[PDB]
């Protein structure tokens, strides 16, 4: 309730996150990985939900929120 933690193990990691609006998301990239099957190991950490994708690069993580973070 205070808060909900996220943790990604790996080697890596450069990152960058940012906020997205309609509807309220939070956003991270991850470089330096390739996307697999431990991903859904991810779905521990939604977020209203959380979504997981790749575009030859570069790992995106997208929450969506039910509260302002």
């Known amino acids: 309730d205070d808060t909900l933690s996220i943790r990604a193990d790996g080697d890596i990691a450069r990152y960058e996150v940012l906020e997205l609006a309609d509807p309220p998301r939070l956003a991270v990239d991850l470089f330096g990985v390739g996307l697999a099957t ?4 991810v779905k521990s950490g939604a977020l209203r ?3 997981v994708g790749a ?3 570069k790992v995106r993580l997208v929450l969506d929120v039910r509260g302002t973070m």
Do not use: G, N, Q, T
Not at 38 to 41: E, L
């Open 38 to 41: 431990r991903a859904p190991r």
């Open 49 to 51: 939900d959380v979504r």
């Open 55 to 57: 575009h030859a690069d």
